[PDB]
Design a binder for this molecule. Structure first.
Ligand code: HEM
Ligand code: ZN
Ligand code: ZN
Lengths: 158, 158
């Protein structure tokens, strides 16, 4: 059974944001790791994996609705040059994606595709966990300054 | 500290091949899944994951060598429309990567970057296992014909 075409188009757009997030978070994670920031690697690596899981959900749903998942067109990665920039870029990506997601949810609701709607709602809740974490780290960077924040990362992980 | 420039360029090219393989194999896998081909999904899915592991190896090595991993440029996916096309496309990709690997291995060796050389040798051994499996499966589809091959798969499954 062919799904709603605009629903599939939304799912592909959202998948597109996840593909950027997977790569951006994975590269940021390994950058953190290479800098010896073990906590940040662990957090960022698991964020990347969670985005992979999201992408998989999108791919499965699109195929079920007889659409064609687009894994070809990779959007712009915004790789930061220091830890503050990297986290700010992650936050910007999450917020952009979240707005897209809320609009998509509304649309799926409007055409009674409740299964797609609810899948996207679960995903939204996940992204909001990451947004909450990011805002906390960034607040601490603001308060401490990046260099003291980084010293504390290393010292507190031990 | 900083690695050989050409080694890093090879590692980035090779990483590029892995990024295509990740997406191509993942989509192929979920296509198999959606078609109720559980065994084909399982093999293709784990191939995708192994290519992810390969990419991680490249990313970490590049960073250690103080290069910039390229996760932005994604090469051409060649997504098949039936099981035979899809598997043959996977083989083409692997064979192309395999030749790239062999060149890079010889080159890393020549500048005494044995860590990169041996990493690539291990990855190549993995790629060659996939090539082996692909040839045998393609042989079966040729022998049976794709219509009867697919009927066998579902007879045997569930
Ligand atoms: C730069 C690209 C990617 C990299 C480097 C990468 C890397 C990884 C790694 C390291 C793992 C963990 C494997 C292990 O446990 O040893 C993983 C798991 C996984 N990946 Fe990816 N991945 C990438 C892209 C993708 C994409 C695009 C998708 C889907 C569209 C995807 C789907 C998955 C899934 C479903 C898992 C298993 C999650 C779980 O159940 O634990 N990956 N990936
Ligand atoms: Zn997500
Ligand atoms: Zn590989």
């Amino acid at each position: 059974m062919k799904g709603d075409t605009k629903v599939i188009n939304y799912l592909n757009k959202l998948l597109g944001n996840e593909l950027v997030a997977i790569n951006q978070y994975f590269l940021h994670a390994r950058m953190f790791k290479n800098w010896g920031l073990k906590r940040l690697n662990d957090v960022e690596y698991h964020e990347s994996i969670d985005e992979m899981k999201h992408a998989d959900r999108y791919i499965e749903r699109i195929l079920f609705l007889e659409g064609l998942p687009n894994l070809q067109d990779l959007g712009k990665l915004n790789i930061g040059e220091d830890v503050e920039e990297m986290l700010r870029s992650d936050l910007a990506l999450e917020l952009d994606g979240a707005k897209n997601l809320r609009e998509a949810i509304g649309y799926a609701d409007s055409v009674h595709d409740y299964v797609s709607r609810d899948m996207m709602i679960e995903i939204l809740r996940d992204e909001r966990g990451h947004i909450d974490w990011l805002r906390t780290e960034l607040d601490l960077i603001q308060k401490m300054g990046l260099q003291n924040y980084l010293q504390a990362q290393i010292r507190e992980e031990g």
